[PDB]
mmCIF file of N, CA, C and O in Angstrom:
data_model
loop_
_atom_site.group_PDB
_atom_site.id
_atom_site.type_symbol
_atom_site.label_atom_id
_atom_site.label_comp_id
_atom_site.label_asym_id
_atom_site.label_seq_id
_atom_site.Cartn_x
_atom_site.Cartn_y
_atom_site.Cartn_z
ATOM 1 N N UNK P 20 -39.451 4.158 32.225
ATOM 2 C CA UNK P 20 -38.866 3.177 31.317
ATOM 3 C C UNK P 20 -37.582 3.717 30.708
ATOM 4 O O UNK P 20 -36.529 3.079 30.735
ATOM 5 N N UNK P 21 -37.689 4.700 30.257
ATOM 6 C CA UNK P 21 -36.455 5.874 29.659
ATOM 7 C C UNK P 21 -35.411 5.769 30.758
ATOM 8 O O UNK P 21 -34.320 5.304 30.430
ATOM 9 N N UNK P 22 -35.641 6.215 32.271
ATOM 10 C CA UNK P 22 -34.498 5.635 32.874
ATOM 11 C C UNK P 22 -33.631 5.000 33.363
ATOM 12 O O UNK P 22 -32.463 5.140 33.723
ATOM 13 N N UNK P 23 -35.055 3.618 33.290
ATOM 14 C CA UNK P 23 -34.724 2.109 33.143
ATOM 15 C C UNK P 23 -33.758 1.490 32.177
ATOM 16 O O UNK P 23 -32.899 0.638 32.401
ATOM 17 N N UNK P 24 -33.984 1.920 31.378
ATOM 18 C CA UNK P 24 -33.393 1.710 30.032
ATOM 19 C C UNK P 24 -31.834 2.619 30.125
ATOM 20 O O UNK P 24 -30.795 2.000 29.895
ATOM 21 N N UNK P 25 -31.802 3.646 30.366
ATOM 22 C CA UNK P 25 -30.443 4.240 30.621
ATOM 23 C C UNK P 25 -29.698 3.212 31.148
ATOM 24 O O UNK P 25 -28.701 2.655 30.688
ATOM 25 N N UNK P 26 -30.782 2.886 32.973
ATOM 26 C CA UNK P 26 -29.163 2.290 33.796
ATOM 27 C C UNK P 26 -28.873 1.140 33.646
ATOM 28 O O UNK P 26 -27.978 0.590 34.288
ATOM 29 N N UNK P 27 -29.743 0.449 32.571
ATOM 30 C CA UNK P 27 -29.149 -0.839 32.246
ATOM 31 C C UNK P 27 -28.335 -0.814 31.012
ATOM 32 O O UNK P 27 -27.719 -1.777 30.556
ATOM 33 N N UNK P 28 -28.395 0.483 30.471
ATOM 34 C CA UNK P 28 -27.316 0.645 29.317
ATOM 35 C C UNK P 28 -25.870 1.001 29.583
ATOM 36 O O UNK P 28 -24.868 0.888 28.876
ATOM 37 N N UNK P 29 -26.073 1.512 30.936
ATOM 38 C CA UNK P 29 -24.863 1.950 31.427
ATOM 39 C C UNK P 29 -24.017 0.378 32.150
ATOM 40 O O UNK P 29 -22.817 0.128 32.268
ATOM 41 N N UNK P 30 -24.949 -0.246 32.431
ATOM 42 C CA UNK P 30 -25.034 -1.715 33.357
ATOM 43 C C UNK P 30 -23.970 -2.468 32.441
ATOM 44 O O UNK P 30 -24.515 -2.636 31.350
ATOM 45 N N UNK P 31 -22.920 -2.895 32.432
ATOM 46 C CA UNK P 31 -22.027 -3.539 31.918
ATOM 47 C C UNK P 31 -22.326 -5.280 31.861
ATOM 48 O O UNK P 31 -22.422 -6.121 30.967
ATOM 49 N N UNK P 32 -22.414 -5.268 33.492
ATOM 50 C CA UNK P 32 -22.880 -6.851 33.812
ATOM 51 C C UNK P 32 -24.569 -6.793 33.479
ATOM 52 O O UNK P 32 -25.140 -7.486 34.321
ATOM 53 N N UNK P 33 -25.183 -6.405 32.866
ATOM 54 C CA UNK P 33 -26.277 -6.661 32.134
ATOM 55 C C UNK P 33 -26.759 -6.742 30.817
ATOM 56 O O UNK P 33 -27.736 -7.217 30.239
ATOM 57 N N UNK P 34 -25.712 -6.101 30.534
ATOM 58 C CA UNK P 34 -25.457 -6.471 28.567
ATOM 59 C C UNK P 34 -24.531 -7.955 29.001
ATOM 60 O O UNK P 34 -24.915 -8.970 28.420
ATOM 61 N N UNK P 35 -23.675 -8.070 29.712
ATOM 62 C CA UNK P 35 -23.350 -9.073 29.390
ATOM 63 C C UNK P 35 -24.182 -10.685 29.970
ATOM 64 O O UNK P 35 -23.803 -11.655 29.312
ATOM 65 N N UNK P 36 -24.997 -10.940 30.846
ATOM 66 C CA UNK P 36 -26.233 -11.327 31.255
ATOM 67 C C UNK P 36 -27.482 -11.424 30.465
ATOM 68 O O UNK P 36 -28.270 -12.369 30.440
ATOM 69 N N UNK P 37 -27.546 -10.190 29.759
ATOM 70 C CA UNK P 37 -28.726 -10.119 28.806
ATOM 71 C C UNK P 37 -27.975 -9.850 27.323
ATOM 72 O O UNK P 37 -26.862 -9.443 26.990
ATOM 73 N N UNK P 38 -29.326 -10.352 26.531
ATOM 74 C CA UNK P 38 -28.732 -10.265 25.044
ATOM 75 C C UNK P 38 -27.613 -10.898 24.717
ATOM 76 O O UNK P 38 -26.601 -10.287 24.374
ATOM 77 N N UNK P 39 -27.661 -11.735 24.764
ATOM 78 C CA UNK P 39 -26.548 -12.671 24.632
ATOM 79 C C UNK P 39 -25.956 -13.883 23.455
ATOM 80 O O UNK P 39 -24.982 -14.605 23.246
ATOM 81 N N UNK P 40 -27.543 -13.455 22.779
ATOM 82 C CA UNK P 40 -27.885 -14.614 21.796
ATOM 83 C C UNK P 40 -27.040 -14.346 20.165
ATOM 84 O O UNK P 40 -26.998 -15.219 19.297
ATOM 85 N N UNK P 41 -26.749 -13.699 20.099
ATOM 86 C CA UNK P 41 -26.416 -13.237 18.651
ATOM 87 C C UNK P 41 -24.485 -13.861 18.382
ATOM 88 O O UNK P 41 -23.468 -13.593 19.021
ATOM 89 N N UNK P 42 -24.737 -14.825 17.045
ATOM 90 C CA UNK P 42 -22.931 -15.304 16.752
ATOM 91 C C UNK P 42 -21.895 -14.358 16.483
ATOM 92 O O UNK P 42 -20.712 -14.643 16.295
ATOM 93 N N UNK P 43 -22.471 -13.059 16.473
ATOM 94 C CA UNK P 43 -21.602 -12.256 16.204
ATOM 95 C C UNK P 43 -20.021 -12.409 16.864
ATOM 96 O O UNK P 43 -18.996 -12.130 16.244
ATOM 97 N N UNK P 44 -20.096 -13.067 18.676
ATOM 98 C CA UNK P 44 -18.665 -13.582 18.727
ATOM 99 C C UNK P 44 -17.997 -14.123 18.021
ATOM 100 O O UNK P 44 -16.931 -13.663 17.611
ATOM 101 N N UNK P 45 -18.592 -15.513 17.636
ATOM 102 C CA UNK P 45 -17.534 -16.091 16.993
ATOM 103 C C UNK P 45 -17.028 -15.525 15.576
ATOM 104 O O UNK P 45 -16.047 -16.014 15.017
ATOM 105 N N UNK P 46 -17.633 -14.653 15.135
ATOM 106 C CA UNK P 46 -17.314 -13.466 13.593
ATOM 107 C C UNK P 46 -15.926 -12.716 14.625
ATOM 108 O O UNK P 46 -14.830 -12.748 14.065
ATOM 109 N N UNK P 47 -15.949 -12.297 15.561
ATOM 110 C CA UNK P 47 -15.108 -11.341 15.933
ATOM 111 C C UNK P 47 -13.448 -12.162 16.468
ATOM 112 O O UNK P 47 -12.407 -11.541 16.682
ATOM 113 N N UNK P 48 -13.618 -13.523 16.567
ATOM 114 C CA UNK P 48 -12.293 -13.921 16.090
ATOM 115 C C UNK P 48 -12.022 -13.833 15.046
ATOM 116 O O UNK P 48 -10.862 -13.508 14.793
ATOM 117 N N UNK P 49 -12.802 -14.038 14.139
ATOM 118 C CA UNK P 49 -12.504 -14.531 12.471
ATOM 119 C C UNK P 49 -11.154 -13.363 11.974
ATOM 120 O O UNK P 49 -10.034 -13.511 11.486
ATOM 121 N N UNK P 50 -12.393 -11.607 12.625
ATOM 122 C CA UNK P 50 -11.473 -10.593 12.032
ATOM 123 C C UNK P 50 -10.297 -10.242 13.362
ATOM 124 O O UNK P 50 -9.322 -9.520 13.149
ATOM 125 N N UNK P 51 -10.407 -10.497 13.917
ATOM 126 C CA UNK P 51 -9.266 -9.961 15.186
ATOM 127 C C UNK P 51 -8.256 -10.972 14.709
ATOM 128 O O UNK P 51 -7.209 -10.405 14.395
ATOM 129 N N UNK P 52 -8.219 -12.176 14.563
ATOM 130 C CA UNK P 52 -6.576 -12.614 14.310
ATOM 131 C C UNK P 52 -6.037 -12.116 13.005
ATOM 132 O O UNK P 52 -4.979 -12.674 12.714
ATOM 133 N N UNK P 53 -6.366 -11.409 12.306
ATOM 134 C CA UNK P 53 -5.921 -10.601 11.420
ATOM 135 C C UNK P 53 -4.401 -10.261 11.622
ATOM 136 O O UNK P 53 -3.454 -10.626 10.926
ATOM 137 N N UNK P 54 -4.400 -9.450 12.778
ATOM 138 C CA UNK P 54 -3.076 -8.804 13.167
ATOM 139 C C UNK P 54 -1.997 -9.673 13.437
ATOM 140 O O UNK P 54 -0.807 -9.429 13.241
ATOM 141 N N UNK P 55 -2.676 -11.087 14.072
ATOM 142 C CA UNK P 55 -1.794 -12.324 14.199
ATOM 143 C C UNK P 55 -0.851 -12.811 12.640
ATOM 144 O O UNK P 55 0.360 -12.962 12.482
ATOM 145 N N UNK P 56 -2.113 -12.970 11.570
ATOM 146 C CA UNK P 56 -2.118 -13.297 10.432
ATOM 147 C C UNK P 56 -0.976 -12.042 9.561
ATOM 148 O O UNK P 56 -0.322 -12.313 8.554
ATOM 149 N N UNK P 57 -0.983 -10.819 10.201
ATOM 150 C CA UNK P 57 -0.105 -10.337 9.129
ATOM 151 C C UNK P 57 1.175 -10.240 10.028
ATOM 152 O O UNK P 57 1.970 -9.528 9.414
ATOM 153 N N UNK P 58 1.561 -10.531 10.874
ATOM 154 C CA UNK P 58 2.905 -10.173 11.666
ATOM 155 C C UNK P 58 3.785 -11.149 10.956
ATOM 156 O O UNK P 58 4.878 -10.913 10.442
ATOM 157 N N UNK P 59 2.838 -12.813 11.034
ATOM 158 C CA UNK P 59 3.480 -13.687 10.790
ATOM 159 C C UNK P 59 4.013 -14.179 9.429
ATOM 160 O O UNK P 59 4.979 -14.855 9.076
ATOM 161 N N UNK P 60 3.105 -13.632 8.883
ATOM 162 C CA UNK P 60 3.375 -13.746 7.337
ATOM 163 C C UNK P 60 4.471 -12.997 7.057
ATOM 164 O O UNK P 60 5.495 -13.399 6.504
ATOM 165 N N UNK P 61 4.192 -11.668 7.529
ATOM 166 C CA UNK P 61 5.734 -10.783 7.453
ATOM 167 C C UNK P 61 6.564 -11.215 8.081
ATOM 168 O O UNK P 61 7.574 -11.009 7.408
ATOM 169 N N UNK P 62 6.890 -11.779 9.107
ATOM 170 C CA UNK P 62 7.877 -12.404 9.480
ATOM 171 C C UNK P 62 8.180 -13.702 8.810
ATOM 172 O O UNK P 62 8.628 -14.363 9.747
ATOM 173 N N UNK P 63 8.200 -14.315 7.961
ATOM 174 C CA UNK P 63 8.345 -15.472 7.423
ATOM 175 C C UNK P 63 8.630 -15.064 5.904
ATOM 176 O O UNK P 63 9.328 -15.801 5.208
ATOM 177 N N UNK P 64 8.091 -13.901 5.406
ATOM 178 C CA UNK P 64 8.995 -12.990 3.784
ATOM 179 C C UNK P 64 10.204 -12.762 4.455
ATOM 180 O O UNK P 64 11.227 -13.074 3.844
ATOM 181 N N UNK P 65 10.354 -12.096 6.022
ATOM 182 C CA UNK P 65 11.327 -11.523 6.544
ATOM 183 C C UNK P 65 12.597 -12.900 6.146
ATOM 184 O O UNK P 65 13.667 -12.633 5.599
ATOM 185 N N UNK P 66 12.165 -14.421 6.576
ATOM 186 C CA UNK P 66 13.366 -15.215 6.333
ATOM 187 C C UNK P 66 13.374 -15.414 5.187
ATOM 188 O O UNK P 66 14.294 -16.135 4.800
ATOM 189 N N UNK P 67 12.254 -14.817 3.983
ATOM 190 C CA UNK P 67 12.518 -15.330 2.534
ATOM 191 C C UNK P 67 13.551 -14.489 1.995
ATOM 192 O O UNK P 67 14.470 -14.885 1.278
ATOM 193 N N UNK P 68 13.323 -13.116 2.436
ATOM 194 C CA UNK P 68 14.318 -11.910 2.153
ATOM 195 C C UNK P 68 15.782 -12.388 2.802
ATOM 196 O O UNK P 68 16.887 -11.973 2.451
ATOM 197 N N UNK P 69 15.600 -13.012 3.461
ATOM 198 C CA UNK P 69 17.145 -13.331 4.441
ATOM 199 C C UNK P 69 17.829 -14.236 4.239
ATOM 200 O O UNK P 69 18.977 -14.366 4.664
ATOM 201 N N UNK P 70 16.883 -15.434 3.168
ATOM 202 C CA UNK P 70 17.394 -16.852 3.069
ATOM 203 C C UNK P 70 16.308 -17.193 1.377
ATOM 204 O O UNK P 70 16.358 -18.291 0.823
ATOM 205 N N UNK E 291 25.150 -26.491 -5.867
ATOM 206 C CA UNK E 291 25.585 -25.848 -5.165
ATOM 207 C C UNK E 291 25.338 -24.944 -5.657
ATOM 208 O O UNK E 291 24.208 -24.461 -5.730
ATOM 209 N N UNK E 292 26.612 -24.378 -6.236
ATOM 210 C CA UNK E 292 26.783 -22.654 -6.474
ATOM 211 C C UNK E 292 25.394 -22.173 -7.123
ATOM 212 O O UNK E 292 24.933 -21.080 -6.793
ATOM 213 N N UNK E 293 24.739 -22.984 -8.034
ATOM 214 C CA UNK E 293 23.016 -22.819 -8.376
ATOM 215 C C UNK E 293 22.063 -22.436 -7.317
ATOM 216 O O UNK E 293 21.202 -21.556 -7.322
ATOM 217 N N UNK E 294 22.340 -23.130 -6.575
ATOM 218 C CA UNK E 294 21.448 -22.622 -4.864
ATOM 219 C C UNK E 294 21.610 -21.214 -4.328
ATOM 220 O O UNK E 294 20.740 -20.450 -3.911
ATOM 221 N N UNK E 295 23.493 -20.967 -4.481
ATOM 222 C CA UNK E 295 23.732 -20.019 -3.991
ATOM 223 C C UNK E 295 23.340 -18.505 -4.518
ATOM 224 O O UNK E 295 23.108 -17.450 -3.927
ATOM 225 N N UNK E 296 23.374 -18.867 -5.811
ATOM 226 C CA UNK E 296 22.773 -17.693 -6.800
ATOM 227 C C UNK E 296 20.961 -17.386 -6.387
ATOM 228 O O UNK E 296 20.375 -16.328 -6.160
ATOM 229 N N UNK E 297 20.360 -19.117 -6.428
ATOM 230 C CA UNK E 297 18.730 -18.547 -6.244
ATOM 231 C C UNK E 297 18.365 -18.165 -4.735
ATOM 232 O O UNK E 297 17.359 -17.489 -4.520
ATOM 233 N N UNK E 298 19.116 -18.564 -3.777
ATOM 234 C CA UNK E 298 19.184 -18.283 -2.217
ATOM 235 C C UNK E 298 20.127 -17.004 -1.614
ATOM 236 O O UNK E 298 19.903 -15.813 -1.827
ATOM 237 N N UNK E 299 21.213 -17.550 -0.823
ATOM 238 C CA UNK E 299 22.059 -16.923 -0.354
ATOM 239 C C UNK E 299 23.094 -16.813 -0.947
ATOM 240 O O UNK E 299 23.932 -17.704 -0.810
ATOM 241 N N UNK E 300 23.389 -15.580 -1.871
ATOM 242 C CA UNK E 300 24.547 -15.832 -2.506
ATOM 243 C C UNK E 300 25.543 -15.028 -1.833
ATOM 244 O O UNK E 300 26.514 -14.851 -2.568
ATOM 245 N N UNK E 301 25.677 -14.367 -0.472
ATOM 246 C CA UNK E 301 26.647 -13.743 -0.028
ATOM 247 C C UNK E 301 27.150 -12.072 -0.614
ATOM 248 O O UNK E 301 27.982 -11.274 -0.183
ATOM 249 N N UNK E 302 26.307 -12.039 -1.649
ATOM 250 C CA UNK E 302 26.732 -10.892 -2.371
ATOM 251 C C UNK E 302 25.512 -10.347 -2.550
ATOM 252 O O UNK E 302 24.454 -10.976 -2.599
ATOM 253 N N UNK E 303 25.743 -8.423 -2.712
ATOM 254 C CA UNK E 303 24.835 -7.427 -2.880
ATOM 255 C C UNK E 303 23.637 -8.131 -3.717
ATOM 256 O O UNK E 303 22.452 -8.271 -3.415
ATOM 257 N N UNK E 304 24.494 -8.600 -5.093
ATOM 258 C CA UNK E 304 23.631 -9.372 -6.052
ATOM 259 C C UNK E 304 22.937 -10.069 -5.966
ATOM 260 O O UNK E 304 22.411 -10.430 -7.018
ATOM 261 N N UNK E 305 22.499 -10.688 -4.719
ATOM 262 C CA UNK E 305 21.479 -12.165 -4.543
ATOM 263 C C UNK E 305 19.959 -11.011 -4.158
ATOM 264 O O UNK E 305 19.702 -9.992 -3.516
ATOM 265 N N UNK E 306 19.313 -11.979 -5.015
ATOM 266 C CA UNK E 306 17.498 -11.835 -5.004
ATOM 267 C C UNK E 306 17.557 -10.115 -5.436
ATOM 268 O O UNK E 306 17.089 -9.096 -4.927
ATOM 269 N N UNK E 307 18.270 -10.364 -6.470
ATOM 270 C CA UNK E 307 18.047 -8.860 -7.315
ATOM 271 C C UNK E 307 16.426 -8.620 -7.846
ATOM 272 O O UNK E 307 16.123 -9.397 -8.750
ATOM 273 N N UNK E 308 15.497 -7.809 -7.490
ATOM 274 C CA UNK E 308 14.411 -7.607 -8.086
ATOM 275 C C UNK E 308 14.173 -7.571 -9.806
ATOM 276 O O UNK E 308 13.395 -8.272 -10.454
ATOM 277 N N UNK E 309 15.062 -6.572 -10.278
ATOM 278 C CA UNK E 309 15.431 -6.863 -11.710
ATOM 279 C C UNK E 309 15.876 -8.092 -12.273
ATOM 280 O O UNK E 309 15.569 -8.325 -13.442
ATOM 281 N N UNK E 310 16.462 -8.806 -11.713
ATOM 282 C CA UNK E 310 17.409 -10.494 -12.545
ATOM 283 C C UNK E 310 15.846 -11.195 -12.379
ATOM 284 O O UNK E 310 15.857 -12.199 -13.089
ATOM 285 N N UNK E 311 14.749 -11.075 -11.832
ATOM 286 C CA UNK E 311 13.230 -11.628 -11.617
ATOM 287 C C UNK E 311 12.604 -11.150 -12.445
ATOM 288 O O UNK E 311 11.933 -11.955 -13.090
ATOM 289 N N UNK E 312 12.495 -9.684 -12.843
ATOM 290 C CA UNK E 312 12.072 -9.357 -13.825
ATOM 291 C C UNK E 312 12.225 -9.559 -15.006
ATOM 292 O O UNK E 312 11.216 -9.550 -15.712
ATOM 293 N N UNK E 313 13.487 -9.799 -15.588
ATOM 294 C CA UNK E 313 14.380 -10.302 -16.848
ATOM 295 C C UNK E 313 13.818 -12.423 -16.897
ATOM 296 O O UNK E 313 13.797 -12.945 -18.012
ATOM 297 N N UNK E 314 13.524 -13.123 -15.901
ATOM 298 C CA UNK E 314 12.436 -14.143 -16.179
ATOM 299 C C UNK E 314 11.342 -13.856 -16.475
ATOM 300 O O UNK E 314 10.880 -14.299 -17.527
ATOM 301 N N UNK E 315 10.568 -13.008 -15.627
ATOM 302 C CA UNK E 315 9.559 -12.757 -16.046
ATOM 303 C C UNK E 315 8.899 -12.317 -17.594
ATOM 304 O O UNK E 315 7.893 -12.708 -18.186
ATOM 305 N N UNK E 316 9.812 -11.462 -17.893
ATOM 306 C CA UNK E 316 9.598 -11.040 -19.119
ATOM 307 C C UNK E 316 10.161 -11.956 -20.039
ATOM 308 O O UNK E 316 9.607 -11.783 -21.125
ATOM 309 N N UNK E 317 11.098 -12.946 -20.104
ATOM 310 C CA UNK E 317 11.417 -13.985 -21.080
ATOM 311 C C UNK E 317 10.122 -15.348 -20.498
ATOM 312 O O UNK E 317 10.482 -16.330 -21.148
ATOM 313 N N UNK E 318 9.241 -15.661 -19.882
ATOM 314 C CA UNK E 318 8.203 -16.173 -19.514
ATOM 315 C C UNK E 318 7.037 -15.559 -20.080
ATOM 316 O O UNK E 318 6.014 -16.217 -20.272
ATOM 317 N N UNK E 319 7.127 -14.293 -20.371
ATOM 318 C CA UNK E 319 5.749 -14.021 -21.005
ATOM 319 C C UNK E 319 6.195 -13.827 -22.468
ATOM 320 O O UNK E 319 5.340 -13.770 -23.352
ATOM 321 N N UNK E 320 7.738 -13.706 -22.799
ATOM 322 C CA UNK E 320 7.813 -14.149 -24.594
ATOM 323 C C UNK E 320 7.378 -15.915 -24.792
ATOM 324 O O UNK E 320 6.659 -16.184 -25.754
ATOM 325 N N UNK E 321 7.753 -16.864 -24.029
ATOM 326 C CA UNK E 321 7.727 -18.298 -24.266
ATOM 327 C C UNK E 321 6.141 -18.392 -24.307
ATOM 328 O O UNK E 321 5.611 -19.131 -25.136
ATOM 329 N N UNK E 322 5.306 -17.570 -23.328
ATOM 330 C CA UNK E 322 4.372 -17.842 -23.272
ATOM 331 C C UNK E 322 3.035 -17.419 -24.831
ATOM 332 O O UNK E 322 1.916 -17.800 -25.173
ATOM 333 N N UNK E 323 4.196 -16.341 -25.371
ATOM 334 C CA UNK E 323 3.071 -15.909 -26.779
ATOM 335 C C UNK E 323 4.308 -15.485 -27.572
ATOM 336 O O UNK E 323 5.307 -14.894 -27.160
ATOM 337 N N UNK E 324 4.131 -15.751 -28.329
ATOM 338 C CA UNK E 324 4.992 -15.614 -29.812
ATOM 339 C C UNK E 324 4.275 -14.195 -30.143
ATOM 340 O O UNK E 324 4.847 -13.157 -29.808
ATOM 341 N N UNK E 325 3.504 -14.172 -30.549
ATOM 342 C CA UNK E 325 2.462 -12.721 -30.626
ATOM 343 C C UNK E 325 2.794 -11.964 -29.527
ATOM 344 O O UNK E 325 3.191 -12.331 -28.422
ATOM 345 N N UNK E 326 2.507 -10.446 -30.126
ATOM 346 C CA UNK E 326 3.154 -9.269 -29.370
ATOM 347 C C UNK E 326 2.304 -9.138 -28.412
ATOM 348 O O UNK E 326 2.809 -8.654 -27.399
ATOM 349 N N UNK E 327 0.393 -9.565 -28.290
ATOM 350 C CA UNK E 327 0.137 -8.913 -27.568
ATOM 351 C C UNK E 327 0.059 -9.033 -25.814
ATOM 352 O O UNK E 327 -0.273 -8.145 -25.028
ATOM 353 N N UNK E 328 0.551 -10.665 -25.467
ATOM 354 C CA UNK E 328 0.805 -10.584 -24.369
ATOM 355 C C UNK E 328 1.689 -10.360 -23.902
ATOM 356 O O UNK E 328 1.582 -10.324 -22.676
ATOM 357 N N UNK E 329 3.598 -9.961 -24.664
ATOM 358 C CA UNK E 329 4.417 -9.439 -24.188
ATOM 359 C C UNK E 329 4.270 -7.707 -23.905
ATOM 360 O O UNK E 329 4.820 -7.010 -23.052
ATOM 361 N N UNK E 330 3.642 -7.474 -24.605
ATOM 362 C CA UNK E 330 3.123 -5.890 -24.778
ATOM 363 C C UNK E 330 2.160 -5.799 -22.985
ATOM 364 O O UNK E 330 1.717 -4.693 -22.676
ATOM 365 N N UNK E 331 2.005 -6.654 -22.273
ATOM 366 C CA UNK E 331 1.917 -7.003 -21.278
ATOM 367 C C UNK E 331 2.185 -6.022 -20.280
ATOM 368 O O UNK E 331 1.550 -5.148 -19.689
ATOM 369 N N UNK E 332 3.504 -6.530 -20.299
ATOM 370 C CA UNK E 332 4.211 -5.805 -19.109
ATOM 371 C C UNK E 332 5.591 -4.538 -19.532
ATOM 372 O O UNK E 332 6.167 -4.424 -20.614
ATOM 373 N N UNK E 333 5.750 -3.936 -18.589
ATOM 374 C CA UNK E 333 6.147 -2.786 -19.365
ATOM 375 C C UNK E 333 7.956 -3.325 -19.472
ATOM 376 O O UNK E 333 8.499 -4.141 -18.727
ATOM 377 N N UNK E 334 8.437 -2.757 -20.347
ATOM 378 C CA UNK E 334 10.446 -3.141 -20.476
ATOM 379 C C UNK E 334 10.731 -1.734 -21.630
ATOM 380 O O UNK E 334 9.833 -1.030 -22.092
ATOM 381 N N UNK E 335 12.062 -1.602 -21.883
ATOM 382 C CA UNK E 335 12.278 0.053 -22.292
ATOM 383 C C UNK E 335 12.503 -0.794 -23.625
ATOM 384 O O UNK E 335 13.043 -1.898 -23.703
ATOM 385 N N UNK E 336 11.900 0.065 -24.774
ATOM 386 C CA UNK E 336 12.519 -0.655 -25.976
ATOM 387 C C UNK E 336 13.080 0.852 -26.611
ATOM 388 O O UNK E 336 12.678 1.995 -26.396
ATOM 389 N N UNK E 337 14.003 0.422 -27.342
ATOM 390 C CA UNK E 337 15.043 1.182 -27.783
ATOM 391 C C UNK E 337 14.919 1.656 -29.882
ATOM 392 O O UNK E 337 15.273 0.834 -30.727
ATOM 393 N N UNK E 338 14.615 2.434 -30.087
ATOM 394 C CA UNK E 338 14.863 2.340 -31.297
ATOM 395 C C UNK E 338 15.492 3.366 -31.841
ATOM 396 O O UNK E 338 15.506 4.228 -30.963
ATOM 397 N N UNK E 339 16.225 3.927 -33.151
ATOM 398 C CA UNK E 339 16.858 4.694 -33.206
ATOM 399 C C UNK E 339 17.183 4.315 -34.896
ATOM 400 O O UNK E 339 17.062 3.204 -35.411
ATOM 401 N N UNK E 340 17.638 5.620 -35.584
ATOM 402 C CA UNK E 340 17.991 5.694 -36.883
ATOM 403 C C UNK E 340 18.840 4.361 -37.431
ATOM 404 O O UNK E 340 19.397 3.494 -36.757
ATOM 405 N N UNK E 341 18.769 4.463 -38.543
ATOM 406 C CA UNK E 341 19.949 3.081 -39.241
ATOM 407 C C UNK E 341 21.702 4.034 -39.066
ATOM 408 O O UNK E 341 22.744 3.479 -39.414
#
């Protein structure tokens, strides 16, 4: 079972096949456009500073 | 016009001086209390000295 359990941990296409159930995706846009969220904002002080 | 140019683009070093914002600010928090203790607020250099 112990090594069962290894090669499906190693198994890429089986985490993604199995276990699948949890919303945690849709949480991981929420924080990933972050980086979107601060470029743009700084770029838009950038035309307040300019204009 | 030239009102715009002063709060926007005024072409000169002088436009969107951080200090000329501060000097509202601090006449905004006198309008806002007659009493010292919300001008005592924010910090400004006060000056005093012998007669």
């Amino acid at each position: 079972v112990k090594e069962v359990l290894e090669d499906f941990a190693e198994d890429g296409e089986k985490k993604i096949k199995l276990l699948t159930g949890k919303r945690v995706q849709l949480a991981e846009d929420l924080k990933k456009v972050r980086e979107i969220q601060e470029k743009l904002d700084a770029f838009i002080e950038a035309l307040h500073q300019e204009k | 016009v030239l009102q715009k140019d002063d709060k926007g683009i005024h072409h000169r070093k002088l436009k969107k001086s951080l200090i000329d914002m501060y000097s509202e600010v601090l006449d905004v928090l006198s309008d806002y209390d007659a009493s010292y203790n919300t001008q005592d607020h924010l910090p400004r250099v006060v000056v005093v000295g012998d007669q």
